[PDB]
Amino acid sequence: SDPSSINGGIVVAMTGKDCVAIACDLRLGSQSLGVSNKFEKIFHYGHVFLGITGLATDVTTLNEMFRYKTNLYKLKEERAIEPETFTQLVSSSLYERRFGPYFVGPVVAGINSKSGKPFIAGFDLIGCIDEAKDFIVSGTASDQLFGMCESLYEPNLEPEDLFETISQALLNAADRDALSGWGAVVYIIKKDEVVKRYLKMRQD
Template identity: 75%
Template sequence: MRERLWRLNKVEKEFQNPYKGNVASLAMLPTAPHTVNVTIHLIGPSVFGCSQHIRVMSSPFSINGGACVAMVGKDCVAIACDLRLGLQSLTVSNNFPKVFNYGDVYLGLTGLATDVATVSDLFRYKVNMYRLREERNIAPSTFANLVSSSLYEKRFGPFFVSPVVAGLDPKTGKPFICGFDSIGCIDFAKDFIVAGTASDQLFGTCEGLWEPDLEPEDLFETISQALLNAVDRDALSGWGAHVYIIEKDKVTKRLLKGRQD
């Protein structure tokens, strides 16, 4: 029995921490990365004698609100946006269009209103330079790559916008739509693309109403009903809409009047 206890003590000493009591050696101990979860509860008045209020900053994409949707039809394409400009729940204007024309291509921009204005002017300049250099209008697929590369240039300080591109290919006449995130990742689609604060509602209405190979008038009715019913369920968008129906030989722009509340 004594021999067994002696062996146990010997093993314990052999495995004893060699750095024990040595402060300099403790600093040399290998450390593994670990995560610490800290929960802070603020109760009662602050050190200045006033109550503490925690204010959560909202996303820049939802400050001004807005909604945009593009749909594919039979040899045609449609893009629509709402007209509201807000400061969260405060409506500032009901005439703030978010679809911009660049020759044969249309660009919808939702997000922070200041960035919407900046980005639309930036692409106006770049498309004009392309037209002067190439002596032709920019194609939708080329414009999509231009948007993607331009947004990726600012990836470390991105524009808070969600672009949507729509148009017809000048050679084949096939509809082209795509969407982007704020740093230029392209999302190609063959049915519809949505963006803005009402995107969740737009996904539901578009999936329920869209059908393949819609004629221009049917496409207009579908995109109009999808947008109006979606923005009626979103407090940060609405107040009417602009709808563009793009065909091979013409572009039809229509104004929709929605709920004004």
């Protein structure tokens, strides 16, 4: 019944030293039933990454919507959109449905191409921005992720170290949530290279 927990899923983002990381599980379900183990929740528009949890139809819809809006932004501005600017666009777009909202928990992650500053942000379903320095969590195991991130995280981690921290935060949170799991992906993002890693986890 609760739209935010029908399909299940989780997303987590972290900052490091001159880098950011964003990760998600791959499960799509119909409550107790597992339907897909390939439902990726992270999308990118140029160098800006967006993770979305919640109702799967709205996840798919918002991706198509922000792809639409960022493609137009680029044609007019003659440049790729930045994370700070994209974050405001996501907030604007969600609040325009204030009284008929998308049931989602978006997470933005990226590095400003000009200043080189790492950036992450989270939102509620109606657009409120949570701009954090350390980490952002979202999903059915958000309580679990808050506990893992708040204890495992330390600032100024190197990319290959950050990878292990975020991966363990996701994996162990997902294994305490019935509606999350069935695979996982981690994006490691630097100013001009992005690596994507699929994790091996329990398939139950």
